[PDB]
């Protein structure tokens, strides 16, 4: 319902803030199992819901909503235990999610007016605007998972930390919701050169600043793995100095 | 007929050249 800038800001800005606040409280005023258990449940519930709802949607905004719920879920799975490696991977996931979602909203905002509310209006973006279609595919595959991207690297370090922290249960559900998401998305992308029912050649195209911001983040996503040392280092500094 | 006759634009241009000169000096003090 809410307009696109409003919902973008609502997705990106408050979530990081409230996550930092949750971390600051859960380090200090928790119990042995109270908060960890009240989150361990919501994490699996979130991954499952993201999968089994985003699998079937017919509005390009609600799909974004359920994918956001899913990634918040993955982050909460990262929250499960309380070791340094775990919270490190937690913060890394938060950051990667912030970037990916400003990217996705850049796209869905540059595809706004002629497509007031539709998902079938991927009217040959492979043909009428190929670079934009490639960028959308990159952002989505990063949002879900594929060989080296940003989102895949983030989820992989999340599950690495989870396994090494003493929870052999979040990985199965996490990997299976990831793989159903991947099947669905990679079926959607490869559905972009079968045929095209509708066509919405667009007066929209990305004046200058949406284009620059997009280009920057999209170059970041693919090019993250060739040098992810400083992010790990700064996240280590942060998480280590959160309480110690 | 040898001048620019728009006050606001001229103030803005003074501000712009001041900006670029200041940035150059700042860099010179890196």
């Amino acid at each position: 319902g809410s307009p696109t800038p409003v919902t973008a800001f609502l997705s990106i800005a408050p979530k990081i803030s409230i996550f930092a606040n949750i971390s600051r409280v859960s380090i200090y005023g928790s119990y042995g199992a109270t908060l960890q258990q009240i989150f361990c449940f919501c994490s699996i519930a979130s991954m499952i819901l993201g999968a089994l709802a985003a699998m079937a949607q017919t509005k390009v905004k609600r799909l974004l909503a359920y994918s956001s719920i899913g990634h918040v879920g993955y982050i909460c799975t990262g929250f499960s235990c309380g070791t340094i490696e775990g919270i490190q991977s937690l913060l890394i996931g938060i950051f990667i999610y912030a970037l990916m979602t400003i990217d996705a909203f850049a796209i869905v905002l540059a595809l706004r007016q002629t497509r007031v509310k539709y998902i079938a209006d991927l009217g040959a973006l492979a043909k009428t605007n190929p670079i934009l279609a490639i960028t959308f595919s990159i952002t989505m595959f990063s949002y879900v998972g594929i060989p080296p991207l940003a989102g895949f690297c983030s989820k992989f370090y999340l599950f690495f930390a989870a396994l090494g922290c003493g929870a052999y249960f979040l990985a199965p559900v996490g990997v299976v919701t990831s793989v159903i998401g991947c099947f669905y998305y990679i079926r959607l992308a490869k559905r972009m050169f079968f045929d095209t029912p509708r066509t919405w050649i667009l007066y929209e195209p990305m004046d200058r600043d949406k284009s620059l911001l997009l280009a920057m983040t999209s170059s970041f996503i693919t090019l993250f793995f060739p040098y992810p040392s400083p992010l790990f280092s700064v996240t280590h500094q942060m998480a280590l100095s959160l309480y110690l | 007929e040898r001048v620019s006759t728009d006050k606001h634009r001229n103030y803005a241009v003074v501000a712009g050249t001041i900006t670029i000169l200041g940035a150059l000096g700042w860099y010179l003090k890196g």
Binding site: - | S4, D6, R9, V13
Partner: protein
Amino acid sequence: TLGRAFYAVGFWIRETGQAIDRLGSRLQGNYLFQEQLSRHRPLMNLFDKYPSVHKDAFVAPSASLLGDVHVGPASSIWYGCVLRGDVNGIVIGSGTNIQDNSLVHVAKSNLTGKVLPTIIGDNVTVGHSAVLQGCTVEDEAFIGMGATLLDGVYVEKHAMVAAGALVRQNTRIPYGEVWGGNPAKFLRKLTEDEMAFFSQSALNYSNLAQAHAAENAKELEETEFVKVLHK
């Protein structure tokens, strides 16, 4: 393709030149660099396929010849021609008339090297509203107006194609033939006085073209320019 690299960096440099000039103009407080006016260079190139018109060959200032098009002396390109030479070149000999409202076209790129050239060999009249797409027309030819010559056609040596008629692919009109209608079918034979008349019309239009060009070189009439700047 080092030439094409030079061309591209030339575009970059000249484009920076235009931009810095416009910055200078905005600083100087003069927005005259917006007076939209049609470029329409009557002779135009693409990369190195510039036309080549011989001196003393009248080309109306409203024509449009672009691509590899070459044309020889005593020729006339009368107001409203489109001579395209992008893919395959156009060659046009001496003493020829390509009248107003005519294009000597070249088929947009077909897959194979099926893009035939177009040759228009001297002493040829090509009247008003004439489309010649990929053809071979030779000396002492008459193409009387309303004419269409589709790709693959060869007309030669004192031959006439009447009026308002089209000639399909792969058709040949040799000496002493007139074809007409849709499609172009053979009607009858010619007459020797008619052939001499072909030649005389060629010469008469050569003279007409001399006159028109000498008039088109008449110093641009500043009075109307200062008038239109007044109001």
